[PDB]
Nucleic acid binder design. Structure first.
Ligand SMILES: [Zn+2]
Ligand SMILES: [Zn+2]
Ligand SMILES: [Zn+2]
Lengths: 148, 107
RNA sequence: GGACUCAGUAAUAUGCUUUGGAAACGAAGCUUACAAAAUGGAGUCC
């Protein structure tokens, strides 16, 4: 079966539906607490089957979704794993392309972690978690991440 | 379609000895061995990290390597998302964009 | 908004190919990043 953070988990790698939910409900919180700070997190899991056009559209909506009156910083969490990371990268990179052309600025934070699927085999199935915002300083506790 | 040119790489002499490029064809352990050798040799070159680059088909495997060094070999790694311009001919040279990853592994 | 199909060379997870040796054990190599899935891939079902 599948292992995360050295711990066995009830997961089927072949199911993106199942694995993306686990990422959202377990992995992302394991890295970022939205409770103690002024951030508004929008989640966006990506599979290899996702349409680029429709997904960039969604991210454009998600990035401009939080209330402008309450002084909330709009943060979108784009995340994927293994065979699905490719399509994520495309969606992510095109989205930023369509953002900087208005002479606006995007800021991103990336974290890499993995699933361990299992003489004993031990294969690394990678996990990419990207945070995007129009605010340069985010109140989230993302020290382990990579600024870009 | 007729032929596809590789990416332009504006690298200096010192970068050439600190950067690895992962191919779709590259086997896993072959890539491990090569990164290891670069980690030991980067001391002489005078850089903190070994840059590991991959795009398209190779993305997953490139990142899987970054997972090995980060976890099983306790290395501090930065991860960047990249866009790469690539020229094709189908006659006329046309531009095409492919997405990839820069993976810096610190010594 | 949900659930999916489509790329057969990571064909080989400290391995693998070629190579030397009876064997012990050696040798060479497997980086100059992509899959018409980035003109914002192509389709299906609810
Ligand atoms: Zn050329
Ligand atoms: Zn040189
Ligand atoms: Zn030299």
């Amino acid at each position: 079966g599948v292992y995360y953070n050295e711990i066995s988990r009830d997961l089927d790698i072949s199911s993106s539906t199942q694995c993306l939910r686990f990422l959202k409900e377990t992995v992302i919180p394991s890295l970022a607490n939205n409770g103690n700070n002024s951030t508004s997190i929008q989640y966006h899991g990506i599979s290899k089957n996702d349409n680029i056009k429709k997904s960039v559209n969604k991210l454009d909506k998600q990035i401009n979704m939080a209330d402008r009156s309450l002084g909330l910083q709009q943060v979108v969490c784009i995340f994927s794993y293994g065979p699905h990371i490719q399509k994520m990268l495309s969606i992510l990179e095109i989205f930023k392309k369509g953002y900087i052309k208005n002479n606006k600025k995007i800021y991103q934070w990336n974290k890499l972690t993995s699933f361990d699927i299992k003489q004993e085999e031990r294969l690394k199935v990678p996990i990419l978690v990207t945070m995007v915002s129009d605010s340069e300083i985010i109140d989230l506790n993302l020290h382990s991440f990579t600024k870009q | 379609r007729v032929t596809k040119h590789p990416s332009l790489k504006t690298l200096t002499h010192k970068q050439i000895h600190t950067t690895i490029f992962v191919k779709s064809t590259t086997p896993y352990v072959s890539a491990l061995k090569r990164i290891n050798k670069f980690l030991d040799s980067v001391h002489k070159q005078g850089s903190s990290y070994v840059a590991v680059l991959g795009m398209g088909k190779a993305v997953e495997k490139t990142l899987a390597l970054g997972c090995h060094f980060q976890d099983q070999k306790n290395k501090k790694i930065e991860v960047y998302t990249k866009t790469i311009e690539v020229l094709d001919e189908v006659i006329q040279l046309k531009k095409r964009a492919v997405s990839g990853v820069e993976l810096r592994i610190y010594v």
